């Protein structure tokens, strides 16, 4: 009743501001620009310094013809939408939206520890332990998003920051969607499908538990289970019903990636009857303390390196581009709930 209570608390909670979302809460002169952290086709995402407070925040800046040009309008209200709207220990913090005449605005907390991605290549592979450490924040974020009819649909290692807690926080809901039933939109990684995404069905949360059979797969190995030079090799991978694990797997890690990595959705842990629970109480998760995982109890197996609030050096070096305003408007109507 503790898990029922608290879901329908969170769910309440997420409503009420997914019915009425915040607009307009600050303006690109209220910040300093350091550094560009990332970048993408439509977007980029920059380090920032509040000018009044001093505080450092990750700005998207998504171009608003860009977006419409590669058909992501729905999708960046989406985003935009939803992380307004959440509250999760493990989600990254959307503090600020706006819009000017080029541009969307996304301001969230920094995470200065870098993603989960750069700290797998270097070490090369987490040991069990340390996998199930952070798989168990994505279990219990997925039962929060799942609760309130979301999907998230980009688990990847690059979408996962590692905070000064060694704590995982998710950025990037870029294809989150609140969906009742099915949808049918192809997106996500190539590497992270789920066999239905590739077959083009009406398809459900079971995609989020597949992605996470490949992120476990890939934290523990090293490398993601179906791999190729061209996304139609990796799609006949996966669609194959064939997966090779490590020798240095665990039998309990191999049989709870068998589960997630189930072709047949009908079939995939996440997605019977039990739902979550056939996950948490998987022998592999035996030793994971879900409540102290939440109240973020537990000593982190790593805690990244870094010197401050605005330090960089966990992300890597982007050609430094300006941050143009049109002083015409674009796509005004296309964005107007945003």
């Not at 607009?23 to 970048?39: S, Y």
């Not at 990254?92 to 605005?105: A, G």
Request: hydrophobic share 40%; charged share 25%; glycine share 6%.
């Amino acid at each position: 009743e503790s898990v029922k209570e608290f879901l329908a608390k969170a769910k309440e909670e997420f409503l009420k501001k997914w019915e009425s979302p915040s607009q307009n809460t600050a303006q690109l002169d209220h910040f300093d620009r350091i550094k560009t952290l990332g970048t993408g086709s439509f977007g980029r995402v920059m380090l920032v310094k509040h000018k009044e407070t001093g505080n450092h925040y990750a700005m998207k800046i998504l171009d608003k013809q860009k977006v419409v040009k590669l058909k992501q309008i729905e999708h960046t209200l989406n985003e935009k939408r939803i992380l307004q709207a959440v509250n999760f220990p493990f989600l990254v913090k959307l503090e600020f939206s706006f819009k000017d005449n080029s541009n969307l605005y996304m301001v969230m907390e920094y995470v200065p520890g870098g993603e989960m991605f750069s700290h797998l290549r270097r070490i090369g592979r987490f040991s069990e332990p340390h996998a199930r450490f952070y798989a168990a924040q994505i279990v219990l974020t997925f039962e929060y998003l799942h609760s309130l009819d979301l999907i998230y649909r980009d688990l990847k290692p690059e979408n996962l920051l590692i905070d000064q807690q060694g704590y995982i926080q998710v950025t990037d809901f870029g294809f989150a969607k609140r969906v009742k039933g099915r949808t049918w939109t192809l997106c996500g990684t190539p590497e992270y499908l789920a066999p239905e995404i590739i077959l083009s069905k009406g398809y459900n949360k079971a995609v989020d538990w597949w992605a996470l059979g490949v992120l476990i797969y890939e934290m523990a190995a090293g490398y993601p289970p179906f791999f190729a030079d061209q996304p139609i090799q990796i799609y006949e991978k996966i669609v194959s019903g064939k997966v090779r694990f490590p020798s240095h797997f665990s039998s309990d890690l191999k049989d709870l990636l068998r589960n997630l990595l189930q072709v047949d959705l009908t079939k995939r842990f996440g997605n019977l009857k039990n739902g979550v629970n056939d996950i948490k109480n998987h022998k592999w998760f035996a030793t994971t303390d879900w409540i102290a995982i939440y109240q973020r109890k537990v000593e982190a197996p790593f805690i990244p390196k870094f010197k401050g609030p605005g330090d960089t050096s966990n992300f890597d070096d982007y050609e430094e581009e300006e941050i143009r305003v049109s002083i015409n408007e674009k796509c005004g109507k296309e964005f107007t709930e945003f």
